[PDB]
Amino acid sequence: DITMQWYQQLQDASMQCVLTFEGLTNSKDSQAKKIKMDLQKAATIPVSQISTIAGSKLKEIFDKIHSLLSGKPVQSGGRSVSVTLNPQGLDFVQYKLAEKFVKQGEEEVASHHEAAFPIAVVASGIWELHPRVGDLILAHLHKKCPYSVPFYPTFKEGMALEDYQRMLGYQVKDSKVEQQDNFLKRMSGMIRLYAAIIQLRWPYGNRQEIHPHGLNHGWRWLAQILNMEPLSDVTATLLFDFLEVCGNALMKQYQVQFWKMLILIKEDYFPRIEAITSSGQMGSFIRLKQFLEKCLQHKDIPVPKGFLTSSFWRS
Amino acid sequence: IIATDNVLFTPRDKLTVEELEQFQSKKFTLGKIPLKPPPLELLN
Amino acid sequence: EDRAAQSLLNKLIRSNLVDNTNQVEVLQRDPNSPLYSVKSFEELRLKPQLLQGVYAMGFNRPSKIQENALPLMLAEPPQNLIAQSQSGTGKTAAFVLAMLSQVEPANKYPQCLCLSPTYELALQTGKVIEQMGKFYPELKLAYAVRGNKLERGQKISEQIVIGTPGTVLDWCSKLKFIDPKKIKVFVLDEADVMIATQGHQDQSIRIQRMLPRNCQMLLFSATFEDSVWKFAQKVVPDPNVIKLKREEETLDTIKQYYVLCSSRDEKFQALCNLYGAITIAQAMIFCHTRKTASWLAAELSKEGHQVALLSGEMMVEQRAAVIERFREGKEKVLVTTNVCARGIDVEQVSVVINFDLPVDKDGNPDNETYLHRIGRTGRFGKRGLAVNMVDSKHSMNILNRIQEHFNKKIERLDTDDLDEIEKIAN
Ligand SMILES: Nc1ncnc2c1ncn2[C@@H]1O[C@H](COP(=O)(O)OP(=O)(O)NP(=O)(O)O)[C@@H](O)[C@H]1O
Ligand SMILES: [Mg+2]
């Protein structure tokens, strides 16, 4: 409940932000849509630009966002734009910026696991300079993927199924329901992003402050889920791609205590899945063992494929 | 002018007796993993 | 013409099988003979050093085409084969495995001969040999291609040979570098491209005729053309035939759209305005003119946008490097023109943009190009996106004609009214 209470604090706190700019969105005037247009535009694109080419140009995106959020003018397509145009713009750009980071993790990272780090660092860095934006991230990240909280949504009695699938985070429309395959990835990419943000820190600026969402939340995550009964395909998948991304940073931090947690899932939580998963979904559970059978004997969890190297930073 | 500190590890304070005994075992007990991170003392 | 190059680029960028859900047809010469089918490498009972190499390079179990091809080739007596399956199904890995099994370790002379249309393609096939047969000490390979100048009187000691068609002929006959009567296996890789040169077809046959009769004849082709099938029969006598229908790709799971724009600067404004509207990871943009592409990519870069540019002047290996970076995420958008325009398999692509419509020469819709271009995104149920830029009524005329062929509505997109754009693909 400590988590569920904290889970609601962020959710209804975001709803407060949905309403603080209420009127900027619900405006149909010509100028009223031009403003709403140019802000969301020049606030959600730099995040889409985040590449793996070089940390040298990755600073441009960071600075362009810091200027935008801090109020300075920012060069957009055509004429420059700033938040100073509207008082509601700030509390609006912070909302749309937050969704983009999870969205970039939703689509890009799900497909391309390595892009999780060059996006996280910018997020983990903007989180420091502007803590308000971070709670908004934790807001959107949590609803779109309640498994990141982590809490498994329980079935409320007397309710239709399509109502319940939406709660699980499945994208659903009038008649279309998102397949499981094209759903599982959307959740991988989200927690692979989450597993990257907690271990990375923005190098530039020389800040003595501390990580806003510390690697402590990575321990609780693994703990909080390993103490409850696993879902068939969701757990054994999410449990893997979280450890692949953040299992190297946790091994260094909580040296022996982390290993204990691994020799548990090996002999206490693996049986908890062999029965739960049917023969038609053992795909995820198999990767999870192939991942640990090595790591346990190798005494080492490989650094995640895609980690930003020194070369990436200087270059 | 102050600069705050961290919470990566949890002090020996704020740590229940059931949790202290978990961190001290050579094996964890299924379903009773402490939520709070371990202390600096027992990284072994 | 450009089929050899397309094959070459397809080799350099292919990272794994192209999965297929069509069942393989088998046309065994003696139908009375039961069908040969395998589901794992253990069943074939390969040599230890050979199976060691197979598992070494990442193969868990035979591919769909290999489930029928491998046993048929390893069966006794030696049975010939003509295989037809699209590029990327495992054809090359198949006859490389077959070769290394039939060879004898101690005998220092050519026992297996492969014909590749070109020198570059020969190298790629050679690389698969070196990998799969890395656990075969003393087993070497010799490249019998133009440019491999050799001194008269020399005798080859390699147990395998690979070379272009015109030169391999010289090796065996006039220069006496090879004795054809010791060849136990013969392959003609990529017959689909082999026929593109009239000289190659004749030179390949003449070589095939100098071989013994007990020599296992093998031929492979990506396409099912008639000119191929007519050519394959002349090369492989008393043959078996294996066919695998090309994976048909559809638009069932893609949402198609388009935008009306007055000029290029509006097509560009239309594109930039979209980027803030929806989740867009990486996307491709196909243009009509090389002058326009270089402009667009420049205009894109100018806005602080990481873009990759594919142009025809670039070498083949250079095209691959840009593509590889594109897959690695180094570049987030690829603007191309006539270079690899059918469809490139980059997985993190969320949107396909047709800055100009896929136009065939003569000014008609290029439906094959349009289908493959989007067929790549959204296979086996993935959701993709398609946006067509219309700059005139003639371009608009083509759009409805494409809409006719595929029977899917390409709905209108107004790049204004963000609310609508957010709804486009999520
Ligand atoms: N059994 C297998 N398991 C996994 N990957 C495989 C297997 N067989 C082949 N591959 C890989 O799939 C890709 C295509 O292999 P290849 O043999 O070149 O196919 P394709 O028929 O052969 N191409 P092409 O020669 O142009 O018609 C390569 O990257 C191989 O390493
Ligand atoms: Mg081949």
Numbering used by the authors:
A (entry chain B): 384 to 698
B (entry chain C): 379 to 422
C (entry chain F): 54 to 479
Quote the original article.
DDX19 is a member of the DEAD-box helicase family, which are RNA-dependent ATPases composed of two RecA domains (referred to as DDX19NTD and DDX19CTD throughout the text). Gle1CTD plays an important organizational role by providing spatially separated binding sites for Nup42GBM and the DEAD-box helicase DDX19/scDbp5.
The heterotrimeric Gle1CTD•Nup42GBM•DDX19∆N53 complex exhibited similar conformations in the presence of ADP or AMP-PNP•Mg2+, with the auto-inhibitory helix still bound between DDX19NTD and DDX19CTD. The Gle1CTD−DDX19CTD interface involves 40 Gle1 and 35 DDX19 residues to generate an interaction interface area of almost 1300 Å2. For a summary of differences, see Supplementary Note 4. These observed structural differences result in a dramatic reduction of the local electrostatic potential at the human Gle1CTD−DDX19CTD interface compared to the yeast Gle1CTD−DDX19CTD interface. Gle1 binding facilitates release from auto-inhibition by first inducing conformational rearrangements in DDX19CTD that partially open DDX19 and generate a cleft between DDX19NTD and DDX19CTD (step 1).
